[PDB]
Design a protein around this ligand. Structure first.
Ligand SMILES: Nc1ncnc2c1ncn2[C@@H]1O[C@H](COP(=O)(O)OP(=O)(O)NP(=O)(O)O)[C@@H](O)[C@H]1O
Ligand SMILES: [Mg+2]
Ligand SMILES: [Zn+2]
Lengths: 187, 233, 597, 176, 241
């Protein structure tokens, strides 16, 4: 089963990826720069919240229809908090695709791009060692306390580490040669 | 003897007139209001010197004394006359502490000597009363005098005292684990911090967690020597 | 002495070999090193403890196990030192910031038979013992020194790294380098650890007739702190030692704790997922509840919904909704009411059972009293506080005084207890279910007298989600069937030699912590249209009558049906409740409260 | 690549057996083997040696590096060095498992040898952990690996390369 | 695993001895103020002297503030103190010419230099002593250190000034009596068979003496060889006033 991968960290989403489809559903705050009829009308200057896909669709580089702003968690007040000790913050109570969504805001040419990139990279480097140690060393135990705070991207790395551990333990204890049934074990 | 270089680090951090001059402005305000304590934001210190900031939080005592001496030298370099009006200066902390933010339940014996940030609800107070730091005696028949720190007769105007008070902080009952009663801790307030909180207040206290001595049973009582006190509503 | 040092060194080597050579398995499959791997994985996670088993050590070398049984204090420290030096070579080299080696705590475990407290002959001083019992008292945590430094008052000489003994005994300082009491402790150089104390009660079935139960004092250290609370039944392993002219006290130093009854293993989750998946789980659970009691299938179904409960909610403007469910049983004598209460107390993960005749208002909610030490006033928790998060069984409910039943009106609805006495004002939590049993005013239900069988006031009858009336019936076929059932139950006490109670207990806890439902839109629409009919009928009955009824229909009943719908959905681990679930919820409420009204 | 496939490669290593029967020279696609004479040694690949041992048709002889005196010196040298030391066989772990499970009856001091080989695995894995962490902290771009074996690579390697892919993507993103 | 991927050589230590000419460029105002600020420093050392006793903590505490204020080299820092070190080096070469105008002025600035050097040598941590003695020509090799405890007994019995603790913390090494010249001719301390059991401060005295000798030779060269460079001398009167 060749699941189509997410594109989010690069310059574009992958068209057929389910994760990018869910992630782009998130809402973003904006200001209306030209009045809109039959939506009755929306006057100029009105403040709104609408999905990321629609915001990218309407944002011509002239900034003729609307102008965009960063959500609170990507502004300086919160970046300062991540900088203290990134291990403690809950990136699942933040948006479930923190890095993926954050990487796509750089599209809108804000003056704060140089700060957002440094925030994301430093957060990742800060969190890495705990993911490594805890995934590689937790054998046949309740992992629910460990995996609780991890972002969707980080969770994939946890699963890969666990899989690698399990295979070696099977081989050492001699279980590796036996033939068995696959996902059709459901039935 | 690296603490002489640590004090040197703090002194050049405080001398920020070469880079937008925020802390020099704050010290000037302190002088104008005749005060003797400063409040430093840990985010600025962490930004300028990662090593010194991350060491301060895990070595509260040995690092804060160096910071106090640096402040004393800096204010003396601004005005020696003002620096002679008070025996010693103090520094308080604010900002984000990350892993050191706790409650009276999660605070345990492994936090001893760390800078900690406790929060809860105030339940009681003792009365303000003086404490002696330096005592003096004098003899008019000989123009002689003696001193001690912590015949002739005592000089109350040449001796000097400071205020002391105790309060108690309790865990938020909404956050108690199932089927248990709330836990609590004792806080010590000293000099210009006395009577800054009263019962029923919700407070957040910054301080250093420390044991008190007590033949010995090898068993101690732990208290939080406050370094700053904050209120919210 | 050098001979003593040589002996210590030799024994330490033997313990080290046990840790780094022991293996399990067969050559037909493959071998694994049991304790090396555990040390590695625990150290890399920041644990610093292991749990050695006496059976294994006894098999590797009998002499070491013998020494560790007869002289535990003298030898256990050699084992702890050995564990430390093995951990180092098993992990080294460590990354930056990790270069300093930490200390390991070693815990003990065994499969052998317990002995009662009464069995402790004083020949057992300092020998290793295993004891069962109940925890009846528990201290708050304190700090205890392991190593210290001291300084002289008059001439400022110092002594440092002074070792302090573990357990409940003290220490004394030197007098040489001066005054008679020349040294004082430096608190900044105290290496301290957590420590706690407990009191143990001998098992109710072990104490003979015509004697008191014995009781014992316990000491607790480092990773063992806040592992238990009072009322729990536990098994303890430790050292037994001492703490008119010749009296001295005695206590036990704990080395391992086992709660006779933890996180669910992956295998257990697969079984619970299977139980949630299979299609007729509701009937399976219904048959597991109180299996000896004949009949009463509807009553057993309602009890199942009580154990799983609805779901807690916090609304946008900050107010709360309670989620959990209250149930009342009322009617004839000899109908097994007390038996069902007695079962639910054992089936629930947390539960308490009390009698209405033998309890007081201050005992049910909370109390204030003076400390036996000091002179200060202190708080105490009643039954409804100890059972926070669980079920409270109130038996003989109709025999409380009026002013005492008034005391629980806050706890049953707002799930909190507000106190203002003796100069203290606080709010405590009580998030628990009430299950109650009662008789008619006339001893058994008298159908000629109607509503006069009930004299509870409306302000408490409206706080129950469901009310059941139970009447005895004299049908011959049921009587013959019941008689045969009872007789074979008695006869099969020897001959005896779907879900078990233990399995069901763990399953309930798992479902409660992981799953929280909500209504589907159409389900809410259906329930809305039903509620209007129900209110209209109740109003017309009161209008037609000359008398107002004791069991009202209010918005609390609308909430009650929603809570039952959520419970039914929770048994199947489904995120949304459906019209099928609302149909069953309405059926259960239709039987009980509308037969009572 | 799974542990099963790494073992499949390890089974090509040659070992010495003493047959208890007689057979002519046999020609295989991979080479010529034999002749086989009773009571006299011959070289064969490990997959064949294990199979004949199970069916009670031969005796195994330990490889010359499987010796307590040799393995002690190797363990000490490995613990002392700051890097990965070269190894007595590229497939030392796999060969140890296969021979000691089937051929304990012919290999003296087997339970000593198990412990000595386990210690080398424990040391080398720790070095790999430190290297991975250092690679990410310093944001490095290339590294060298001259004495790692294929089982040791395969055990931990997938995690590391998966993490490095994402990190390289985060640091470049400001310049499409 | 093994991974793959300029002014340090100029001044590996804050200490410097002016062997190499800085073969580079300067601005007019730059060399002017580099020298003139040090003139203020020379006066300031003796102003501190008239304030209170030489070399005490009061001296130490005030003196480092002068250096931080005046941007010249320090107790040695790990960041770019090489810029203050080369400024110190360059400005030292510039200072050779001002107070060579009279021998009394030469001796005056030499004396405050000796005081400054003695202060710096008083500040030194152990690692500085260990690396500078090996990285400099100032080798002064030690011999047979295990015998120091026989001299812990003998010196203590034989000396009013020295003590057993000074054997270790003013760490003792063996060099001749002549390197402790004032101590043998005053007969102040334990020396035996022509050898002295010596702490660092004697080698500091030798450093100061050879520094004075080399500097005096340089001042003679300053008096003699300089006229080709003297296309501008406008600062010299303002400097000698
Ligand atoms: N259906 C039944 N199955 C088994 N035992 C039953 C049943 N009904 C009644 N009993 C027996 O009834 C006796 C009394 O049980 P109990 O629980 O006190 O009923 P009760 O309704 O609470 N009686 P009361 O306290 O007078 O109101 C016990 O000995 C039970 O075994
Ligand atoms: Mg009964
Ligand atoms: Zn003394």
């Amino acid at each position: 089963y060749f699941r189509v991968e997410s594109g989010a960290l690069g310059p574009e989403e992958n068209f057929l990826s389910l994760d990018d489809i869910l992630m782009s559903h998130e809402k973003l705050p904006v200001r209306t720069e030209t009045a809109m009829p039959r939506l009755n009308a929306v006057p100029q200057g009105s403040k709104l919240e609408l999905p990321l896909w629609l915001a990218k669709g309407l944002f011509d580089n002239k900034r003729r229809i609307l102008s965009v702003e960063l959500p609170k968690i990507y502004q300086e007040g919160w970046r300062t908090v991540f900088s203290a000790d990134p291990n403690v913050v809950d990136l699942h109570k933040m948006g479930p695709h923190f890095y993926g969504f954050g990487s796509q805001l750089l599209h809108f040419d804000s003056p704060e791009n140089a700060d957002i990139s440094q925030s994301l990279l430093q957060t990742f480097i800060g969190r890495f060692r705990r993911i490594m140690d805890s995934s590689q060393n937790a054998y046949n135990e309740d992992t629910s306390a460990l995996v609780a705070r991890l972002d969707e991207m980080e969770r994939g790395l946890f699963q890969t580490g666990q899989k690698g551990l399990n295979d070696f333990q099977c081989w050492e204890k001699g279980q590796a040669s036996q033939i068995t049934a696959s996902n059709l074990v459901q039935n | 003897v690296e603490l002489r270089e640590a004090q040197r680090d703090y002194l050049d951090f405080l001398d920020d007139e070469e880079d937008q001059g925020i802390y020099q402005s704050k010290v000037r305000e302190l002088i104008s209001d005749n005060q003797y304590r400063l409040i430093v934001n840990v985010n600025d210190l962490r930004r300028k010197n990662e090593k010194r900031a991350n060491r301060l939080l895990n070595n509260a005592f040995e690092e804060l004394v160096a910071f106090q001496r640096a402040l004393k030298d800096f204010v003396a370099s601004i005005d020696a006359t003002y620096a002679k009006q008070y025996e010693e200066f103090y520094v308080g902390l604010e900002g984000s502490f990350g892993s050191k933010h706790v409650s009276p339940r999660t605070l345990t014996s492994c936090f001893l000597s760390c800078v900690v940030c406790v929060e809860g609800i105030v339940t009681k107070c003792s009365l303000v009363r003086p404490k002696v730091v330096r005592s003096v005696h004098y003899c008019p028949a000989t123009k002689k005098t003696i001193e001690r720190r912590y015949p002739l007769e005592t000089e109350y105007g040449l001796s000097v005292y400071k205020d002391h008070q105790t309060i108690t902080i309790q865990e938020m009952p909404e956050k108690a684990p199932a089927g248990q009663l709330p836990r609590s801790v004792d806080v010590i307030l000293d000099d210009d911090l006395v009577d800054k909180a009263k019962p029923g207040d919700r407070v957040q206290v910054v301080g250093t967690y420390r044991c008190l001595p007590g033949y010995t049973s090898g068993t101690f009582r732990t208290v939080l020597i406050a370094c700053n006190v904050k209120q919210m509503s | 002495a050098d001979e003593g040092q040589a002996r210590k060194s030799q024994l330490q080597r033997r313990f080290k070999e046990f840790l780094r050579q022991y293996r399990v398995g067969t050559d037909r499959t493959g071998f694994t090193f049991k304790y090396r791997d555990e040390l590695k994985r625990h150290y890399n996670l920041g644990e610093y403890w292991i749990e050695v088993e006496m059976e294994d050590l006894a098999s590797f070398d009998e002499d070491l196990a013998d020494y560790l049984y007869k002289q535990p204090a003298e030898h256990l420290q050699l084992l702890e030192e050995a564990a430390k030096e093995v951990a180092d070579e098993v992990t080294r080299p460590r990354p930056s910031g990790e270069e300093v080696l930490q200390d390991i705590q070693v815990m003990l475990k065994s499969d052998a038979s317990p002995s009662s407290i009464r069995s402790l002959k004083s020949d057992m001083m300092s020998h290793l013992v295993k004891i069962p019992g109940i925890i009846i008292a528990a201290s708050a945590v304190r700090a205890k020194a392991t190593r210290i430094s001291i300084q002289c008052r008059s001439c400022r000489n110092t002594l440092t790294n002074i070792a302090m003994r573990p357990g409940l005994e003290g220490y004394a300082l030197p007098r040489k380098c001066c005054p008679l009491d020349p040294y004082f402790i430096m608190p900044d150089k105290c290496k301290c650890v957590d420590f706690q104390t407990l009191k143990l009660q001998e098992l109710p079935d072990a104490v003979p007739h015509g004697e008191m139960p014995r009781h014992m004092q316990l000491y607790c250290d480092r990773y063992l702190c806040d592992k238990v609370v009072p009322g729990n039944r536990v098994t303890i392993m430790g050292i037994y030692s001492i703490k008119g002219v010749g009296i001295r006290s005695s206590y036990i130093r704990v080395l391992g704790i086992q709660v006779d009854t933890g996180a669910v293993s992956p295998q257990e989750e697969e079984e619970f997922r299977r139980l949630a998946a299979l299609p007729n789980v509701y009937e399976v659970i219904s048959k597991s509840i109180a299996p000896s009691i004949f009949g009463g299938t509807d009553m057993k179904k309602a009890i199942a919904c009580l154990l799983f409960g609805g779901s807690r909610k916090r609304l946008p403007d900050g107010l709360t909704r309670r989620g959990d469910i209250n149930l009342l049983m009322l009617g004839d004598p000899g109908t097994a009411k007390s038996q069902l209460l007695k079962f639910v107390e054992k089936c629930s993960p947390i539960g308490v059972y009390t009698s209405g005749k033998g309890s007081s208002a201050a005992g049910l909610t909370a109390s204030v009293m003076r400390d036996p030490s000091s002179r200060n006033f202190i708080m105490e928790g009643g039954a409804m506080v100890l059972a926070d998060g669980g079920v409270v069984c109130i038996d003989e409910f109709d025999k409380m005084r009026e002013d005492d039943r008034v005391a629980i009106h806050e706890a049953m609805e707002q799930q909190t207890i507000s106190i203002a006495k003796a100069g203290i004002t606080t709010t405590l939590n009580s998030r628990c279910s009430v299950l109650a049993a009662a008789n008619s005013v006339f001893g058994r239900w008298d159908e000629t007298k109607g509503e006069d069988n009930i004299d509870f006031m409306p302000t408490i009858l409206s706080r129950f989600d469901m009310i059941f009336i139970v009447k005895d019936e004299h049908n011959e076929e049921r009587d013959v069937m019941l008689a045969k059932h009872v007789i074979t139950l008695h006869v099969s006490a020897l001959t005896q030699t779907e879900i078990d109670l233990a399995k069901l207990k763990k399953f309930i806890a798992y479902c409660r912590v992981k799953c929280g439902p909500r209504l589907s839109a159409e389900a809410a629409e259906k329930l809305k249209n039903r509620y209007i009919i129900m209110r209209s009928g109740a109003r017309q009955h009161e209008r037609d009558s000359d008398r107002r009824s004791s069991i009202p229909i209010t918005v609390r009943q609308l909430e009650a049906i929603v809570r039952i719908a959520e419970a039914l959905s929770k048994m199947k681990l489904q995120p949304f409740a459906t019209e099928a679930d609302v149909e069953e919820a309405l059926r259960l409420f239709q039987v009980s409260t509308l037969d009572a009204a | 690549m799974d542990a099963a496939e790494v073992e499949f490669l390890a089974e090509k290593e040659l070992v010495t057996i003493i047959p208890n029967f007689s057979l002519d020279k046999i020609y295989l696609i991979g080479g010529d083997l034999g002749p086989f004479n009773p009571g006299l040694p011959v070289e064969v690949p490990l997959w064949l040696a294990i199979n004949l041992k199970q069916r009670q048709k031969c005796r195994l002889l330990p490889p010359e590096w499987m010796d307590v005196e040799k393995l002690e010196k190797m363990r000490d040298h490995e613990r002392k060095e700051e890097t990965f030391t070269p190894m007595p066989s590229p497939y030392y772990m796999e060969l140890t498992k296969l021979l000691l499970n089937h051929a304990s009856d012919n290999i003296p001091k087997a339970d000593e040898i198990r412990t000595l080989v386990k210690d080398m695995w424990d040391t080398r894995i720790a070095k790999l952990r430190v290297s991975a962490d250092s690679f990410v902290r310093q944001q490095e771009a290339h590294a060298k690996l001259d004495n790692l074996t294929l089982m040791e690579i395969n055990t931990s390697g997938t995690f590391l390369t998966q993490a490095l892919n994402h990190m390289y993507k985060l640091r470049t993103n400001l310049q499409p | 695993m093994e991974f793959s991927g300029q002014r340090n050589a100029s001044y590996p230590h804050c200490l410097q001895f002016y062997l190499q000419p800085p073969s580079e460029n300067i601005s007019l105002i730059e060399f002017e103020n580099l020298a003139i600020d040090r003139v203020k420093l020379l006066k300031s050392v003796e102003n501190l002297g008239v304030s209170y006793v030489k070399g005490t903590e009061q001296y130490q505490s005030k003196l480092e503030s002068e250096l931080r204020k005046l941007k010249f080299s320090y107790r040695e820092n790990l960041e770019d103190e090489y810029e203050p070190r080369r400024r110190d080096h360059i400005s030292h070469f510039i200072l050779r010419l001002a107070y060579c105008q009279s021998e009394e002025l030469r001796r005056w600035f030499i004396q405050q230099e000796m005081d400054l050097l003695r202060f710096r040598f008083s500040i030194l941590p152990k690692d500085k002593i260990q690396d500078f003695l090996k990285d400099s020509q100032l080798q002064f090799e030690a011999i047979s250190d295990e015998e120091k405890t026989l001299r812990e007994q003998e010196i203590v019995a034989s000396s009013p000034s020295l003590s057993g603790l000074k054997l270790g913390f003013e760490s003792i090494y063996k060099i001749p009596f002549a390197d402790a010249l004032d101590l043998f001719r005053g007969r102040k301390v334990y020396l035996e068979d022509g050898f002295a059991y010596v702490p660092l401060k004697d080698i500091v005295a030798i450093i100061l003496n050879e520094f004075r000798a080399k500097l005096s030779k340089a001042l003679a060269l300053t008096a003699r060889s300089l006229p080709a460079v003297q296309s501008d001398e406008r600062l010299q009167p303002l400097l000698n006033h």
